[PDB]
Amino acid sequence: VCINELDNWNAPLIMATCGSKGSTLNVSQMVAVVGQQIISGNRVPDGFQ
């Protein structure tokens, strides 16, 4: 949603449009949502009880 709804001349956009450094997922964790942490193919298993 961010890529089509962010203005041009945006620095995390303009260096992810290139292959300089970053991705379309790296900027998305900085502005919108960071996702769910995985642990070796497991979605944070239970600690106790």
Partner 1 sequence: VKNNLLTPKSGEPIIAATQDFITGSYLISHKDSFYDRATLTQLLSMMSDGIEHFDIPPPAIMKPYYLWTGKQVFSLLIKPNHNSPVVINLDAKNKVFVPPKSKSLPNEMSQNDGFVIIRGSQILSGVMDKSVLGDGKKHSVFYTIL
The one-letter code for the residue type at 40 is S
Single out the residue of 2, 12, 13, 15 in contact with partner 1 (rule: CB under 8 A).
15
Check residue 1 for interaction with partner 1 (CB under 8 A): no
Residue 19's SS3 state is: coil
Residues 19-38 that bind partner 1 (CB under 8 A): 19-21
Alpha-carbon gap, residue 29 to 22, rounded angstroms:
11
Alpha-carbon gap, residue 26 to 28, rounded angstroms:
5
Check residue 2 for interaction with partner 1 (CB under 8 A): no
Task: Please give the residue ranges that form the binding site for partner 1 (CB under 8 A).
Answer: 14-15, 17-21
